[model samples]
Each structure stands twice: as structure tokens, then as C-alpha cells.
Target: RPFKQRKSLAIRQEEVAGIRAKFPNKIPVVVERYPRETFLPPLDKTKFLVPQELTMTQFLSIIRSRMVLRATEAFYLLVNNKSLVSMSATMAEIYRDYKDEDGFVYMTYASQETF
Candidate 1:
């Protein structure tokens, strides 16, 4: 049989509560695609709901799933056109570092080949 995964009672409760709490602290992030990346879909600026504790890497995984990108493709996130965020860095840190006057952390996505 294939390996099965299960969550313990305590672990399940904690995860459920954590998910519930996340909604209250959710932050808005603005994501845009590079203008020259004509290969991407014609998507307007997207607003993402990011939990405070979520890491940049975790956010990227979510984006990858939502965008239905192939596993062979690669992408990157840039902020202020100046800094590239590391995967391990949390959204809270990014928010503190880059939140705009209007209160959103703006980011842009670029294909790996664009670099």
C-alpha cells in the first residue's frame, strides 16, 4: 500500500486554530508580472492574501500552484526593483521592510531567463 499520512488530534487542533487565526492577521500583497514577459497570461495586478507567518518560499509555492506553472519553469520575486526576497524570509519581515504608504507590499514576478 502507498504510505499514508495522518495528523494527531492535538496537531490537527493546533493546525485548525492556526488557520483560523491567520485570517485575522492576513496581509494584502500586490503581485505584478514583468512587462516584457509576453509569454505570461494577460493578468492584471493580482492581490494576494498573505498570512503574517508565511514565508516568501511558501508564498511562491502558492503562486506557482495558482498560476499552474509547469515544474520545469522557474521564476523570481523582486521588490522595489532593488531587492530579491529570499525564500526563508517571512512575509512579516517583508511587510515591515517594504510596506508602501498605502499599506501594501508590492512585488513583481519575472521569468528566470529574464535575469
Candidate 2:
């Protein structure tokens, strides 16, 4: 069956296992934009393979450059759409806590500039 037909549970499970096995030291992150916020365009890479030692601060630094935030505090990273954290948390820590059943950390990029 094709993925278009929607067998994602099993397919995604296997894929997650594959990612984990291949990169045990890295965290698989799915970064996407919030639906309501549209000030910036979509991220070039939907999926990012991040090293475990990387902190959220470090992770977001490059993204900020890519997003061209220029010290924009309005931006926030929402994890699992449930919790928010600081840069002190390592990627591994965040992944261990907020990763999905399919084995990916889902993060949302939101900016409210009042545009």
C-alpha cells in the first residue's frame, strides 16, 4: 500500500526506528510553522537531524539567522504544542521528554508581530 493511501502508523513507526538506529546520538526534529502565524515563510528543511549535545539556544541561533529574527523576542518554540522551554535544555533532554510516539520532536515556530 502506498503512503498516499494512509498506512502511516506502521510506516512512520518503521521510519522512526530506522532514524533511531541510524542516528542514536542525534535527535530527529520536525520543525514547522504555526497555522495562524504567517509573517515568515516555511522552513527550508522540515526535518532537522540535531546532535544530542546541542542546546535549544544553539539550535535556535542558526534557525534565527535563517529566519532572520535579528533578536526578535516575539518568536517562540512550542514543543509538542503543549510545553515551552529555555535554551538550557539540551536537544537530547527535550527529545526524551517531548518526542512523539513516531520518534520525532515536533516543534512549532510562532511569531506574533501584530502584522
Candidate 3:
């Protein structure tokens, strides 16, 4: 079945606003590149400011654009030494599960071949 799409931007903003009302703070997510793969703009300074309510899918899209990777390029986000995050999972959930003592979510990105 095809996914329903209507006023996506409006819906997205509404959802984001609702979530923001609950969790107003931005979540600190650090992205690390796989040792062998080269990420555009480099990964030396790859800290990201993300809304706590953002879903993994949304986060992945942001990363894809930031890295200048084509949509066709396959990539995966891994946590806890290779545990993959589900696209549907919210960042709040991931943060609760995987955030470090300092409250940063550490994620590693790898190409499909490397993963």
C-alpha cells in the first residue's frame, strides 16, 4: 500500500511543535564516521543539535543531506557498538536507551557494505 501524503510540512510542523512543547531542549547527538569511509565535510566536528522528538528516519534524512550523500547511497546508524536503530524509533527513546553519562547520544554511520 502507498503511504498517505498530504500537507506534509504542516503536519510535520504540528507534530514537531507538540513534541517541542513537552521536551523543549535540543538533544546533542554526535555522529562518527566508519574508519574506512570518508564523509563529506569531514567528521572532525560532527556534533548535531536535534529535537528530542525527531524520529530516527528524520534524523537519517538530516544526516544524508549534511553528508551530501545521494538518496540511493545506503547507510546505517549504529549505537552500542553496532546495535542498529529502527527508522520508526524516536530520538527520545534512543536517548533514554543509549545516551552516555553526559547525556549525548553517540552514533556511528557506516555504508551498507561496511555494516
lDDT of each: 0.65, 0.73, 0.66
Judging by TM-score, tell me the better candidate of 1 and 2.
2
Q: Report the number of backbone clashes for model 1.
A: 0
TM-score, per-candidate, Cα-based: 0.67, 0.79, 0.66
Task: Estimate candidate 1's alpha-carbon lDDT, on a 0 to 1 scale.
Answer: 0.65
What lDDT would candidate 2 get against the real structure? Answer: 0.73
Tens digit of lDDT per residue, candidate 1, span 1-115?
1001243546544543564466658766767666666555423336676889999989887766666444436677787545797789898899888865545577777774344
| Number of colliding residue pairs in model 2 | 0
lDDT-based ranking, best first? Answer: 2, 3, 1
User: Which model scores highest in lDDT?
Assistant: 2
lDDT tens digits, residue span 1-115, model 3: 1011222546545544564475568776767676565543334346677877899999977887776435446677887447887889888889889875544567877764243
On TM-score, the stronger of 2 and 3 is 2
Model 2 per-residue lDDT tens digits across residues 59-86 = 8775666564355555777886557787
